[PDB]
Amino acid sequence: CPPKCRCEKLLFYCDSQGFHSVPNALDKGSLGLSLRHNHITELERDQFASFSQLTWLHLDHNQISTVKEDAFQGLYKLKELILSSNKIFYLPNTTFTQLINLQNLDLSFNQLSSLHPELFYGLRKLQTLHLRSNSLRTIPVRLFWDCRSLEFLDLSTNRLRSLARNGFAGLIKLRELHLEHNQLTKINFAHFLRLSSLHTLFLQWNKISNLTCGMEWTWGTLEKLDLTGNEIKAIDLTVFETMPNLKILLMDNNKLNSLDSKILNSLRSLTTVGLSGNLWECSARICALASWLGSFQGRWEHSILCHSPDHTQGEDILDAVHGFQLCW
Numbered sequence: 243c244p245p246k247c248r249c250e251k252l253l254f255y256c257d258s259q260g261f262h263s264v265p266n267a268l269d270k271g272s273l274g275l276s277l278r279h280n281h282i283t284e285l286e287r288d289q290f291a292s293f294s295q296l297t298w299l300h301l302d303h304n305q306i307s308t309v310k311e312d313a314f315q316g317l318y319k320l321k322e323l324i325l326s327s328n329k330i331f332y333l334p335n336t337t338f339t340q341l342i343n344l345q346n347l348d349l350s351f352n353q354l355s356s357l358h359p360e361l362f363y364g365l366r367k368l369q370t371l372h373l374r375s376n377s378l379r380t381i382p383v384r385l386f387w388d389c390r391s392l393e394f395l396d397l398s399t400n401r402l403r404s405l406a407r408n409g410f411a412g413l414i415k416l417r418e419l420h421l422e423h424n425q426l427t428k429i430n431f432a433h434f435l436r437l438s439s440l441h442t443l444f445l446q447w448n449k450i451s452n453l454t455c456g457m458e459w460t461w462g463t464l465e466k467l468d469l470t471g472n473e474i475k476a477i478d479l480t481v482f483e484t485m486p487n488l489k490i491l492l493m494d495n496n497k498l499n500s501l502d503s504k505i506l507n508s509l510r511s512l513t514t515v516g517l518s519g520n521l522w523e524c525s526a527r528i529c530a531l532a533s534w535l536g537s538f539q540g541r542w543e544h545s546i547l548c549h550s551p552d553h554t555q556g557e558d559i560l561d562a563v564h565g566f567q568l569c570w
């Protein structure tokens with residue numbers, strides 16, 4: 243066992259040492275390697291050539307800025323690779339292609355601005371992919387073609403401006419998708435057509451104005467949709483016909499004015515809803531919603547208050563409806 247490193251087994255724990263590069267190990271058959279919280283700034287070719295048998299490799303919390311071609315070559319048995327909390331901004335197209343058994347890949351908290359379309363090719367056994375807290379602006383149509391077994395994808399806290407129109411291919415088994423805290427403007431739910439195993443979709447804290455659906459299709463597996471804190475003011479009358487089994491819908495902190503009876507008649511499988519913090523107009527228009535709320539038997543965590551007109555401001559939707567004879 244190499245200097246400054248304590249080894250519990252064939253696993254090597256070299257965290258918090260004053261390391262500036264990967265150490266040469268006498269023992270080459272190590273199963274794991276942890277180099278957390280060091281001062282590594284660069285990953286060389288075949289740096290891990292000695293550690294062929296490595297199954298997990300932790301390199302988080304380093305100052306890594308440059309990753310050479312073939313940095314991870316020869317690591318066929320590696321199934322977890324953590325590279326979060328570094329200064330990575332470019333990755334060569336061949337950088338992961340040898341990691342054929344990889345299962346968890348973590349690249350969050352890096353300075354990535356774009357990704358080579360073929361970056362993740364051949365990562366068939368990948369299950370979770372963490373790309374949170376990066377500066378990505380776009381995402382290649384062909385990027386996820388091969389993630390045949392991915393079921394968790396995190397693209398939150400980035401700078402995504404748009405969603406590619408024809409491209410979620412290869413994510414047929416994905417269950418949970420995080421797109422929160424980006425900069426999306428519109429949502430066309432037809433764009434998610436390929437994700438036919440999704441249970442949960444997080445879209446909170448974007449800049450979404452519109453909710454539309456261009457294709458008529460049925461998303462039977464979607465059960466939770468978090469749209470909290472957007473700028474939604476308009477919704478196409480069929481976007482929820484698409485989600486018959488939707489059970490949790492959160493639309494707090496938006497700019498919703500009203501909800502059509504056509505919309506609400508498609509939200510009958512809900513068990514939890516969120517409509518607080520909006521711009522509701524307590525006029526004759528709100529009857530569809532008022533009627534829906536009384537009929538409802540599920541949860542809402544925060545009271546849903548009227549915004550307009552001035553003499554209804556701050557009052558419960560139902561209290562205002564029955565108080566002021568707005569409906570029926």
Ligand SMILES: *[C@@H]1O[C@H](CO)[C@@H](O)[C@H](O)[C@H]1NC(C)=O
Pocket residue numbers: 335336360
């Ligand atoms: C990888 O990117 C480099 C750009 O430096 C390019 O020359 C090379 O052809 C690419 N390889 C593949 C397989 O696309």
Ligand SMILES: *[C@@H]1O[C@H](CO)[C@@H](O)[C@H](O)[C@H]1NC(C)=O
Pocket residue numbers: 427428451452476
């Ligand atoms: C959303 O659609 C409405 C009407 O369909 C339109 O007024 C508005 O410009 C659209 N929003 C965007 C961001 O294009």
